[PDB]
C-alpha cells in the first residue's frame, strides 16, 4: 500500500470493467443475431437439439 510501484486497486477496477465489457458484448450479440443461443459456445445441448429440429 501507498507505493509508487504496484497499484492493486487499478487491477481490481480493470477486472470489474472487463466483466462489464463481457456482459455488454454478450448482450449486443443477442441484439444482433436475435438469439439467446446462437452457437455451441452459448450452450451445446440445446443448440444441437435445435439443429436437429
Amino acid at each position: 500500500l501507498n507505493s509508487i510501484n504496484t497499484n492493486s486497486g487499478a487491477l481490481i477496477a480493470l477486472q470489474n470493467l472487463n466483466s462489464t465489457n463481457a456482459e455488454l458484448t454478450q448482450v449486443q450479440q443477442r441484439i444482433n443475431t436475435g438469439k439467446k443461443i446462437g452457437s455451441a459456445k452459448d450452450n451445446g445441448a440445446i443448440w444441437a437439439t435445435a439443429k436437429n429440429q
Binding site: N2, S3, I4, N5, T6, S8, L11
Partner: protein, 53 residues
C-alpha cells in the same frame, strides 16, 4: 486474476512506504546538519590552550 494476485504479492513483499520516508528524510537532513555542527564544535577544542601560553 492469478497473475494480478501474484503481482500484488510481490508488491506487498518489496514495496516501500514513501510517506514514512518523507518524514525520515526531513528528520535525517536536520540530524545531519546538527552532526556537522557538532563535529565542528568538537574540532575547535584545541584552540583554547594556545591562549594560556
Amino acid at each position: 486474476k492469478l497473475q494480478d494476485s501474484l503481482d500484488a504479492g510481490v508488491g506487498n513483499l518489496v514495496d516501500a512506504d514513501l510517506a514514512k520516508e518523507s518524514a525520515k528524510l526531513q528528520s535525517l537532513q536536520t540530524k545531519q546538519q546538527l552532526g556537522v555542527q557538532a563535529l565542528s564544535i568538537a574540532n575547535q577544542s584545541s584552540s583554547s590552550i594556545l591562549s594560556l601560553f
